Amino acid sequence: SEHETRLVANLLENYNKVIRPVEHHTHFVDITVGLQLIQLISVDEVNQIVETNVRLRQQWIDVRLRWNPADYGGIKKIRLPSDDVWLPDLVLYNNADGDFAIVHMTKLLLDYTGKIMWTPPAIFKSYCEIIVTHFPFDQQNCTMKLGIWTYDGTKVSISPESDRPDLSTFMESGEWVMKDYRGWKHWVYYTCCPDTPYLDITYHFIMQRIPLYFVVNVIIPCLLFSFLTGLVFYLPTDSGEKMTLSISVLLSLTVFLLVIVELIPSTSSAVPLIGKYMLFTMIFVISSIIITVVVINTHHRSPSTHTMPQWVRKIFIDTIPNVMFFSTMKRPDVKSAIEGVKYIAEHMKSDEESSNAAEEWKYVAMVIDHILLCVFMLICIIGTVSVF
Amino acid sequence: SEHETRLVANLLENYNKVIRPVEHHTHFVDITVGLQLIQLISVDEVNQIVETNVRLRQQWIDVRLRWNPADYGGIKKIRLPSDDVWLPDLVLYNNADGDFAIVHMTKLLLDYTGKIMWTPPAIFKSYCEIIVTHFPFDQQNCTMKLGIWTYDGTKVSISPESDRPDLSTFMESGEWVMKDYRGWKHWVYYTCCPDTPYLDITYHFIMQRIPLYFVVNVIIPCLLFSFLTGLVFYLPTDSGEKMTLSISVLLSLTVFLLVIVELIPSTSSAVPLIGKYMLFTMIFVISSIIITVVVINTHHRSPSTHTMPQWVRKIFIDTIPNVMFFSTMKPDVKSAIEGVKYIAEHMKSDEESSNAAEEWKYVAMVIDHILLCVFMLICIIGTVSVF
Amino acid sequence: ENEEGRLIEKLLGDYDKRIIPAKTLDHIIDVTLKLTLTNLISLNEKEEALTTNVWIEIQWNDYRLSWNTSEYEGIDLVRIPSELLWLPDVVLENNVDGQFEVAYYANVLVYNDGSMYWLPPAIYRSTCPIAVTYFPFDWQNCSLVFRSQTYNAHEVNLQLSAEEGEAVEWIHIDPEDFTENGEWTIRHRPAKKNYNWQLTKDDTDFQEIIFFLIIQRKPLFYIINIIAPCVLISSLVVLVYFLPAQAGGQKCTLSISVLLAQTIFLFLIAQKVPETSLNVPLIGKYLIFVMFVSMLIVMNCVIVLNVSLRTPNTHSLSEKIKHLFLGFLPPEIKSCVEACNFIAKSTKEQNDSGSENENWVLIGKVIDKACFWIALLLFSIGTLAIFLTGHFNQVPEFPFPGDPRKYVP
Amino acid sequence: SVMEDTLLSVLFETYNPKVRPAQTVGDKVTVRVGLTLTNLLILNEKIEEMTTNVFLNLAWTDYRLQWDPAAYEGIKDLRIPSSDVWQPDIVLMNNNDGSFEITLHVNVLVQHTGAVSWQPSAIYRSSCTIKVMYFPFDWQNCTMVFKSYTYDTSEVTLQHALDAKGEREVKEIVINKDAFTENGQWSIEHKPSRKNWRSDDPSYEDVTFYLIIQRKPLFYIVYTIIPCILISILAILVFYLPPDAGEKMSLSISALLAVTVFLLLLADKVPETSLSVPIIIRYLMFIMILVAFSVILSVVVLNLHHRSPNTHTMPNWIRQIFIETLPPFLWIQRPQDLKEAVEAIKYIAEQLESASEFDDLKKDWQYVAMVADRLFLYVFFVICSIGTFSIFLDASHNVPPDNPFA
Amino acid sequence: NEEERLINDLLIVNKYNKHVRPVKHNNEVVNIALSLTLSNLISLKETDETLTSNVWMDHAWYDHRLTWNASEYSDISILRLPPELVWIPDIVLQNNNDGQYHVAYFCNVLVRPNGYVTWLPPAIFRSSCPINVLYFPFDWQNCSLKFTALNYDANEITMDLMTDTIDGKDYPIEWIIIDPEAFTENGEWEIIHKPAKKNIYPDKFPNGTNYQDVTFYLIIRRKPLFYVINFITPCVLISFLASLAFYLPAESGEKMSTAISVLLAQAVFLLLTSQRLPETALAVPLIGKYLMFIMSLVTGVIVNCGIVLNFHFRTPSTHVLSTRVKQIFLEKLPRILHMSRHDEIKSGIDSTNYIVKQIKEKNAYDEEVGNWNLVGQTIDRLSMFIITPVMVLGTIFIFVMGNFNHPPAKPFEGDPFDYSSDHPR
Ligand SMILES: *[C@@H]1O[C@H](CO)[C@@H](O[C@@H]2O[C@H](CO)[C@@H](O)[C@H](O)[C@H]2NC(C)=O)[C@H](O)[C@H]1NC(C)=O
C-alpha cells in the first residue's frame, strides 16, 4: 500500500526505541498484561518443571506512534514489526530451563490513537514445586511469575487483563484437569528502596492428575502381588514350594519399587504415600517369609530330638482348633525266628510312636499357618470393605 | 579513553577484513597455533566421540594494525572484537558432532607492533577410534586434527606453539589419566597439487581409563557368579537343586554379558577380552549344566532297564576312587508258608535292585567329584596366572 | 517530550562500545560482582553438573556516560540496553556446556555519576566434581567461577560487592525469591576472590571470583526407597539356616534368590551415581559386602546339603568327626524258619542304615546352627558399621577449614 | 544479467517489505496455502507429536512487483530472496515446540503480473492428540493447522492451492510419489484439507491439513502378543501337571512374572494419557489376572492334595460334588515264646489294617484334588480362549472411516 | 597488497549483486558441477533410521562477473572470497531428518582469473535412510543423500556431476570420493558400492524446482561378528538347553524348571532384540523369526514335559493302563528308538495270610507305577528324537539362509556399469 508505506516511513523517521513512551519522564507506561494458556505441554515431576505454551498479550499506549487517519487514506491499524518500537522487558522470574524473556518477536498491531497490542507466543518452562504425597491422585499448584525486569513501579506499571488467565482456546491435556486458575498482582517493597515499589503478576494453575493410567499400570499389579503375598499360608509345607511363591512375590514387589522410584522426584520434603505403602508391603512380605520359614522348621522337626512342650500342645491342639468354625480341621533257629518277629514288632512300635509325634508337630505347623491365613484374610476383608 | 577510541577509529577506517595480512600477496602469514585443554568433558565409547573443552590459542602478525604509541598517549595494547579483523579459518578436520570452526568469537589482544593474540574457547566433539580389546583396562589414543581449510601452505602457514599441548590448567577427569600428549605438524602433497603443500597440526592424547567403576560394578559380580559354577558339582543329586543353582548362575552370567555388550561400541574390529572371557565362562557353565544333567540321569538309573557296562564298572568304581585322596568317600498253613517264602524272595530281589541303584549313585558321585576337582584346578591355575 | 530522549542521544552519540572506559593509561576499572541464588534447580550426578537460577549483579564506573542532572530536568537515572554499552566480559569459566555469557541481556542502569549497574538473570550449568564416597549421605562442594573472558588484572579489577561498607562475601539469598530444592539443603555459601599464582597479572586467568555452595543431600528418600528394602532383603540370607537340609527344603533357592535381588539393587545403584572411578559409593560398598556374604552362605548351604545327604554307601562316618560334632559343639519248617530269619536280618540292616542317615542329618544340623550364628553376627556388624559411618558424615563447621570465619550476613 | 539487475533496482527502489500490499485501503490479499508431504518422519506417541518434512506451497499477489517484460528484454519472472518481499506470516499454530516459522527460506518466484509464489521447506513438530483406545491396532487423526499469525481475516483471505495446471483447487495434501518416502510403520489412508472458522471469533480463518494414518501392527504383534499367548498357554498347562511333581508353583509364578515384565516394558511405548486403556494393555491385564487366579487355584489344589485324615476330615458336600457328580461330567472316572510271636503277628496285621484305611482316605483326598484340578483346567482353557479371541476380534475390527469428515 | 585492489574492483566498482545469477543473458543457464567426499561415516541409527555422515560437499561453477586479467594486476592466479559476498547455488539435502539443509561451515570460495569458482564446505549430514531389517544382523542397507536445487529451476541452473581428466578425456565422477588414507573405515559398516547418479524426472516441467537432483547412494554391509558373538551364540546355546531338558528324569523334579527358565531367557533375548530395531512392519527380522520359532518350540517342549510328568505320576487308584497304550509305549516304540532293554494259632495264621495279601497288592501297585514310569521314559525319549533334530535343523537353516545374503555386486540392477573408482565410463 502506498499510503501505508508513507505512514510507516513517517512514523519511524525520528523514533527512538530506547526511550519509554511517556510524555514526561515522571509518568509511567501503564501496561496491561494477560496470559493465554494454549496448551499444557508437560509436567516433569522428577525435574519439577512445567512446560506450557502461552501467548503473552501486552497492551499499552505509545503517543509517539499516533497519526491522523484522514491524512493517510483512512488507515486505522498497521502491523509493525516488534523490533522497531519500544517493548517492555517482561521476564518470567521463576524460569527453570527455558528463556527468561520473549524470544519470538512477532508483529504488533498499532491503532491510530497510539494503542499497541502485542501477542507473542512463548514456551515457559517454569519451576513447579511438585508435591508427591498423594501420587498418583495428587493436586499440583505451581505458578508463572512475570514482571518487568529493569523498571520499577514508578516507570513501568503492569496490570492483569482479568482476574483469570484466558483459557478459552485451551487444549485439553488428557492427563491433567484445570481445576482452578487465577492471576494476582503483587506489590513488593524492599528495605533499600521503599519509595519505589516493584510490581509483579503471578498466574497460578491448579492441576488435578487423571490417575487411570498410573492406576492400571502400577497400582493394580502391586495390589495383585500384595494379595498373593498371603496365599503362601495356604500352601502345604509338604509341597516344598512355599519359598518359591514367597520369594517370587518379594522380587516382584522390589521390581515395582524400582518402578516407583524412577517415577517420582528424589525430594525428601514429603514421603510419597505410594512408596510408604510399598515399603509396608515389603515389610509384610519379609515377615511372611520369616514366619513361613519358622513354620517349615516346625513342620520338619525331628520327634527324636525335639519334644513338644506342654504349653505348645495346649495352645495349638486343645483350644485354637475349636475356635475356627470355617475350617475343616480334625478336633535253635526257631528261637532266632521268633526273636526276629518280635524285633519287627518292636520296630513297628517305635515307628508308630515317632510318626505320631511327627504328626503332632505337623498339626501344630498347620494350625500356625491357618492362624496367619485368617489374619491375612481379615486384613483383606477390612481393607476392601473400607476403601471400596 | 579518547586516545584509544581515536586509535581504533584510525586503524579500521580502511581495513578490509577479507584480505590476507601480507605486505605482498606472494608472502605467507605465519600463524602459531597452540591448544590448551581445559577439561575432558566425556569419551563416548559407543559413538566413538570425545568431547573436550579447549582454548585454541593463535598468534600472527597483521602489518595493517600497527601504530606509534607516541601519537596515542603511549597505548601499547588494545582489545578488539575478533569480527573486525582478518582471522584464520582453522577447521577441526575430524569433527564428528560439533562445529567445524570456532563459533565463540571472543575479543583478541592487539599489540602495537601488529602482533595479534587470540584465545577463543571451544568444545571439540572430535571423532575417536575406540579400541576395546583391553576393556575396562584399555588406553585410548585419539587426536584433534586442525588445519587451515581454504588456504594452502604457500598462503597461510600454521606451526605449533610447542611440541606439547598446554595442560597446565587441565581439570582432572576422575575417569581418565593423561598418560601422554603430543602435537605434530604434517605436510601433505596431494596428487592434484604437488606445488602447494597442505599443512595440518595433529594433537593426540593418550588416555588411561581408571578401572574402579567397572571392576566394582561388572567384574566382581561376574567373578562371584562364575565361582558358583563349581558348587553345582558339590551339590548332591538328592537335594533336587542342582539345576536350580546352575540355571540361575547361567542366567545371571548371560545378563552380565548383555550389560557388558551395552557398555562397548558395536564395532567388530576386535572382540574385547572381557567379552571373550564372559563367552568362555558361559560356554563352561553350559558344559557344566550338560554334565550335571548327565549326572542326575545316571543317579536315577533304574536297575530294571539299565545294566552297568563293564567299561563303566572297571573305571568309575575300581580306578578313580583309588586315585583321588583328599575326598572322604569309600489246610491253610500252606498259604502262610508260601506267602512267607514269597516275602523272603521279594526282599531278596529288592536288596539286589537296591544294590544296583547304589552302584549307579556311586558312579554319579565319582563323576561329579571328578568334575569338581577339574573346577578347583582351573580356579587355582587361573588365580595364580592372574596374580 | 520524554527528556531521556535527547540525553540518551547525546550520551550514546560518539561512544565506542569496543573501548574500555579507562580514563588514563594506569586507570583500572573496578568491576564489582554479587551473586543472588533464586533456585538450586538441580545437580545432575551422572553429568556432574549443577544447574542454578542466579541473578548476577555487576557494577562498574564508565566515565563517558555522565551528565549534569540540572541540565536534563533532574534525570538522575536511565536504562540503556546492554548491547549498546561497553561491558566487562564477566563469564562463568567452569561451565559444562558452551554457555559462557548470561541468558538474558537485561538493561543497564546508568547513574549521572557514571555508575553502571547491570543485573542480568542467568541459568548456569557449572561443573561440580562429586565425591561419592558417602552416597547417599554425602555433601557436595559445588563452585561457580567468574572471571573476565577478555581483560586482565591490568585493565579490570574484579572485586566482591561492598554493601554498607562491608564486603559481601556470600551468595546472597533473598527469602522473597528462593524455593528450597527439597533434595539439597544449603549449609555454607561463601564467596572469595582467588588468584592463580602460576600466571602473572596478565593472561586473563590471573584473578577469579569464586562462589561456593556447600550443599547437603537429604537422605530420607534414598533411605526409604533403596537402603531399607536392600537391608530387608539381605537380612533373609540368615533364614536358610533353619530350612530342612533335604529335598524340598529350598535352601539354595532362597540363597540364590537373595543374591539375585542384591544384584538387581547393585544395578539400580549404578544408575544413580556418576561413573567416576576415584571412589566406591558407600551403598555400593555395602552391596558388595552383602553379595559376598550371600555367596559365602550359598557355599555354606551347598556344604551343609552335601553333609546331611550323605549315605553309608558313598561316605564313611568317621568316629572322630562324630565325636567332634556330637560331643563338643552341641522240610517246610526249615524253609519257613530260614525265610523268617532272612526277613529279620534285612529289616535290622535297613534300620541301621536309617540310623546312620539320621546321624549324618544331626551333624548337618549342628554345622548349620554354628554357621548361622557366625553369619548373623557378620551381617549385622557389617550393616550397622557401614550405615553408622554413613550417618556420621557431617558437613564441616566452617566453609574453609583453615579460616575461622562463618561467611554469613 | 545487467537487465535483471536494472529491473531489480527499479522494483525495490521504494518497496517496503513491512507493508501488506493493498492497492486501495481495505483491500484483502488472497493467499493460497497448500501442503506437500515429502516424508512423515515420526509419530512420537510418548510426547504426542508428529514430525514431518513438508513444502509449504504459498501463493499471493503483490501489485507493487509489476513490470512490462518488453521494457526489460522479456524477463518473464524473477527469483527474489524471501527476505526482500513481503510475505504473509503463515505459520503452524499447533506446533509442539517453539518453531512457528519455516525452517528453509527459499527464493520467491515473482511473475511479471505480480503473482508471487513461495515453496519453503520445513521440518514441523505438530502436536497431535492420540486416541489410545485400540493401540496398537489403531488409526490416528493428526492435524496441521496453518494460518497467518499476524494478519486476520480482514487483511488476508486464505484459500486453497491450485493444481499444477492451475485449473482447480487442490483440497488435499499433495504427495509427490517420485520424491516421497513411505514411513514403514504408518499408512496414509486419507489426507484432506479444509478451511476452518470460529463462530465466536469472526477474525479467525485457517487451513487445516488432516492426516488419517493407520498403524501397521506387525511389530507389536510379533514382540508382545505372541509371547503373551505362550505365557497364557503355560498358565493353562499348569492345571495338567500332577501335584506330586512339585513344579506347579514354578510354572504358574513364572508365567505371572513373565506377563508382568511384558506389561512393564510395554508401558514404555504407550502414551501416558488417562482417557482410556489401550486394548493391548487390557489384554495384558486380563492375562495377568487370569494367571494370578491360576496361581490361587493351583495353591488350592496343592492344599487339597496334601491333606490327611490325621489332620482334616472330609466335609460331606465336597464328597457329594467332587467324587460323585463332576467326574462323570469331566470324563475323569476312576508257650510263652509262641504267645509273643502270635501277638507280634497280630499287631503287625492291625498296623497294616490301619495303614490301608489311612491310605484309602488319603487317596480319596487326592482324587478330590485331581477332579478339581481337571475342572479348573477346562474352565480356564475356555475363559482364556474366549477372552483372547474376543479382545483381538474387537481390535481387528477397527478401521478409519471411508469418509474423512474433512 | 594488490588483492585488496582486485577485490574492491570486482565487488564494489562493478556493483556486484549477489542475488543475481551469473549469466550474461537471462535465458542462459549456469552449470553447477557437484561431488561429495565422505571423510567419515559417523553412524547409522537403525532405531532412528538416520544416517549421520561427515562429508565435504564440493561445488564448481562459472561467474562471468568474477573474471580479471592477471597481467594487469600482479600475477594473482587464485582468490579467496567469503561466501556471503558472492553468489552461491543453494544445493540442499532434501531428505534430511533434522532442520539442517545447508552446509554447517561456510568456508571461503576459490576464484580463478577465468571465472571458475570452487567451493568445498564440510558438512555433517543427518540424512533419512529407510532400514531393511529383513536379514538383521546379516543385513546390508542402501542409504542415499539426495541433493536438490530449490532456489532455482532447471531452466536457470543445471545440476551436474564433477568431471575429471586423466588422459585428455573428461569422465564424470559417478561415485562418492573416498580418500584411502584420510577415511577411517567404520567399525560396524563397510561400503560396498558408492554410486552417484543425476536423476531427471520427465513427468514434471523444467519450471518446477523438482525436475532434477543429484543422489549419492551408499550401499553398506554390516559386519555381523559383534551380534553373532554377543547375541546369537548365547541364544543358540540356551535354546539347546531346552532340548537337553528332555534327558532329566521325572523323579528329579527339575524338568519344568529347566524348560521354563530357557523360555524366559529366550523371551528376554527377544525383548532386547526388539529394543535394537526400528518399529517398522515391512518384515520380521531374521533373528526375530528365529526367536519366534525357538520360543514356539520351547513352549512345545514345556507342554510335552508336562505331559510326561502327568504320565509318570499316574497310579492304579486314579488311572487304568489299557493294553493299547501298554503295547504302543512298551513293545513297539522302545524297540524302534533302540531304548535300553487252638484259637490263637488260627488267628496268627489269618493275620499272616492278610499280611501276605497286602504285600502282594503293594507289589502289584508298585509294578503298575513302574510301568507308568517306563511309559513316561518312552514318551520323552520320542519327544527328544522328534524335537531336537527340528531345533538343530531350524537353527542351521535360519543362520545359513541369512549368511547367504550379499549385496548384488552391481548397484542399479538393470545398469551394467560398475560405478567404481577404477573404471570410469
Ligand atoms: C538403492 O536404492 C536406490 C533408490 O532407493 C535404487 O535405485 C532404484 O533401483 C530400482 C531397482 O531396479 C530401479 O527400478 C529404480 O529406477 C532406481 N532408481 C534410481 C533413481 O536409480 C538402487 O537400485 C538401490 N541399490 C540396490 C543395490 O538395490
Name residue A169's amino acid.
T
Name residue C166's amino acid.
E
Q: How far is the CA of E222 from the centre of ligand 1 (A)?
A: 19
Question: DSSP assignment, residue C398?
Answer: S
Cβ of residue E207 lying under 6 Å from some atom of ligand 1: no
Question: DSSP assignment, residue C261?
Answer: H
Q: How far is the CA of E415 from the centre of ligand 1 (A)?
A: 10
Q: How far is the CA of D247 from the centre of ligand 1 (A)?
A: 57
Tell the residue nearest (CA) to atom 18 of ligand 1. E412
Note if the bond before A136 is cis, omega within 30 degrees: yes
Tell the residue nearest (CA) to atom 10 of ligand 1. E412
Asked if D349 has any chain E CB less than 8 Å from its own CB, the reply is: yes
Cβ-defined contact of B239 to C309 (cutoff 8 Å): yes
Asked if D71 has any chain E CB less than 8 Å from its own CB, the reply is: no
Contact in structure between E303 and E282 (CB atoms under 8 Å): no
Tell me the backbone φ, ψ of residue D340, rounded to 5 degrees. -65, -35
DSSP string, B276-337: HHHHHHHHHHHHHHHHHHHHHHHHT--TTT----HHHHHHHTTTSTTT--SS-B---HHHHH
Note if the bond before B21 is cis, omega within 30 degrees: no
Name residue B155's amino acid.
K
Tell the residue nearest (CA) to atom 12 of ligand 1. E413
SS3 E342: coil
Residues 100-119 of E with CB under 8 A from B: 104-105, 107-108, 110
**How is residue A146 written as a grid cell?**
512475570
Asked if A9 has any chain D CB less than 8 Å from its own CB, the reply is: yes
Query: Resolution, rounded to a tenth of an Å?
Result: 3.2
Residues in chain C: 409
DSSP string, E292-330: HHHHHHHHHHHHHHHHHHHHHT--TTT----HHHHHIII
Contact in structure between D76 and D69 (CB atoms under 8 Å): yes
Nearest residue to A256 via CA among C71, D54, D260, D36: D260
Asked if A95 has any chain C CB less than 8 Å from its own CB, the reply is: yes
SS3 C177: strand
Q: Minimal Cα–Cα distance from A379 to chain C, Å?
A: 22
DSSP string, E44-71: EETTTTEEEEEEEEEEEEE-GGG---TT
Longest dimension (CA), chain E: 154
Q: Which of E412, E413, E417 to mutate to test the pocket of ligand 1 (most atoms within 8 A of CB)?
A: E412
**How is residue E360 written as a grid cell?**
502282594
Tell the residue nearest (CA) to atom 23 of ligand 1. E412
Q: What is the distance between the alpha carbons of residues E364 and B319, in angstroms, rounded to a whole number?
A: 40
Residues of chain B with Cβ-Cβ distance to C276 below 8 Å are 174-175, 213
What residue ranges do the domains of chain B occupy?
2-212, 213-386
Nearest chain E residue to D248 by CA distance is E256
Q: What is the distance between the alpha carbons of residues D104 and D124, in angstroms, rounded to a whole number?
A: 11
Ramachandran quadrant class, E412 (left: phi over 0; alpha: psi -120 to 50; beta: rest) = left
SS3 C191: strand
Contact in structure between D51 and D41 (CB atoms under 8 Å): yes
Nearest residue to C137 via CA among C285, C268, C38: C285
Cβ-defined contact of A1 to D285 (cutoff 8 Å): no
Nearest residue to D370 via CA among D315, D330, D312: D330
Nearest residue to E410 via CA among E423, E395, E397: E423
Instruction: Give C3-220's CATH code, choosing from 2.70.170.10, 3.90.245.10, 2.30.42.10, 3.40.640.10.
Output: 2.70.170.10
Contact in structure between A59 and A32 (CB atoms under 8 Å): yes
SS3 B43: strand
Q: How far is the CA of E35 from the centre of ligand 1 (A)?
A: 20
Query: H helices then E strands: how many in chain D?
Result: 8, 12
Q: What is the CATH number of domain A213-387?
A: 1.20.58.390
Contact in structure between C182 and C218 (CB atoms under 8 Å): yes
Cβ of residue E106 lying under 6 Å from some atom of ligand 1: no
Q: How far is the CA of E217 from the centre of ligand 1 (A)?
A: 9
Cβ of residue E199 lying under 6 Å from some atom of ligand 1: yes
| Of the partner residues E201, E307, E317, the one whose CB lies closest to the CB of residue D178 | E201
DSSP string, D210-255: EEEEEE-THHHIIIIIHHHHHHHHHHHHTTTS-GGGS-HHHHHHHH
Angle at alpha carbon of residue A273, lines to A269 and A275, rounded to 5° = 90
- The domain containing residue E43 runs over which residues? 2-225
| Of the partner residues A174, A241, A362, the one whose CB lies closest to the CB of residue D275 | A174
Q: What is the distance between the alpha carbons of residues B96 and B49, in angstroms, rounded to a whole number?
A: 7
**How is residue E266 written as a grid cell?**
529366550
Query: H helices then E strands: how many in chain C?
Result: 7, 14
Q: Minimal Cα–Cα distance from A268 to chain D, Å?
A: 25
Cβ of residue E144 lying under 6 Å from some atom of ligand 1: yes
Q: What is the distance between the alpha carbons of residues D230 and D221, in angstroms, rounded to a whole number?
A: 13
Which partners does chain D have (≥3 C-beta pairs < 8 Å)?
A, E
Contact in structure between A87 and A65 (CB atoms under 8 Å): no
**How is residue C368 written as a grid cell?**
548349620
β-strands A121-127, E196-200 pairing: unpaired
Nearest chain D residue to E90 by CA distance is D106
Residues in chain B: 387
Residues of chain B with Cβ-Cβ distance to C310 below 8 Å are 236
Residues 354-373 of D with CB under 8 A from E: 356, 363, 366-367, 370
Question: DSSP assignment, residue A57?
Answer: E
Contact in structure between D294 and D239 (CB atoms under 8 Å): yes
Q: B213-386 domain in CATH 1.20.58.390?
A: yes
SS3 A312: helix
H or E stretch covering D382: helix D336-396
Cα separation values, D31 from A339, D11, D57, D161, D170, Å: 120, 21, 10, 9, 14
Nearest chain E residue to D217 by CA distance is E281
Cα separation values, A183 from A123, A293, C209, Å: 18, 61, 40
Tell the residue nearest (CA) to atom 20 of ligand 1. E199
CATH class of A2-212: mainly beta
β-strands D156-160, D29-44 pairing: parallel
Q: Which of ligand 1's atoms lies nearest the C-alpha of E413?
A: 12
Angle at alpha carbon of residue E311, lines to E306 and E312, rounded to 5° = 100
Q: What is the distance between the alpha carbons of residues C5 and C78, in angstroms, rounded to a whole number?
A: 10
Name residue B327's amino acid.
S
Contact in structure between A147 and A154 (CB atoms under 8 Å): no
Nearest residue to D406 via CA among D208, D128, D144, D138: D208
DSSP string, D10-48: HHTSS--TTS---SSTT--EEEEEEEEEEEEEEEETTTT
Q: What is the distance between the alpha carbons of residues C87 and C106, in angstroms, rounded to a whole number?
A: 12
Cα separation values, E206 from C241, D176, E275, E282, Å: 87, 16, 45, 35
Q: Minimal Cα–Cα distance from B168 to chain E, Å?
A: 31
Nearest chain C residue to B328 by CA distance is C315
Q: Minimal Cα–Cα distance from A44 to chain C, Å?
A: 13
Query: What technique solved it?
Result: cryo-EM
Sequence-separated contacts (24+) of E8-15 with Cβ below 8 Å? E8/B16, E9/E68, E10/E65, E10/E66, E10/E68, E11/E81, E11/E85, E11/E86, E14/E65, E15/D5
Residues of chain B with Cβ-Cβ distance to C332 below 8 Å are 337
Cα separation values, E320 from D19, D334, E363, Å: 99, 8, 16
Asked if A97 has any chain D CB less than 8 Å from its own CB, the reply is: no
| Of the partner residues C81, C119, C242, the one whose CB lies closest to the CB of residue A18 | C81
Question: CB count, 10 Å around CB of A110?
Answer: 23
Contact in structure between C142 and C43 (CB atoms under 8 Å): yes
- The rounded radius of gyration (Å) of the Cα atoms in chain C is 38
Residues of chain A with Cβ-Cβ distance to C123 below 8 Å are 95-97
Question: CB count, 10 Å around CB of D317?
Answer: 8
Residue D66, Cβ density class (10 Å: 0-12 exposed, 13-18 middle, ≥19 buried): middle
H or E stretch covering C347: helix C332-391
Torsion of CA D233, D238, D241, D242, to 10 degrees: -160
Cα separation values, A230 from A293, A374, A378, E173, E265, Å: 14, 10, 11, 76, 29
Q: What is the distance between the alpha carbons of residues D171 and D161, in angstroms, rounded to a whole number?
A: 8
Residues 6 or more apart whose Cβ sits within 8 Å of residue B44 = B50, B51
Contact in structure between B55 and B122 (CB atoms under 8 Å): yes
Residues of chain A with Cβ-Cβ distance to D299 below 8 Å are 231, 234-235, 245
Residues 6 or more apart whose Cβ sits within 8 Å of residue A277 = none
Nearest residue to D60 via CA among D152, D161, D151: D161
DSSP string, E120-183: --EEEEEEE-----TTTTS-EEEEEEEEEE-SS-TTTEEE---EEESSSSEEE--B-B--TTTS
Interface test with D, best of E16, E17, E20 (most D CBs within 10 A): E20
Tell the residue nearest (CA) to atom 21 of ligand 1. E412
Residue E262, Cβ density class (10 Å: 0-12 exposed, 13-18 middle, ≥19 buried): buried
SS3 B93: coil
Residues in chain A: 388
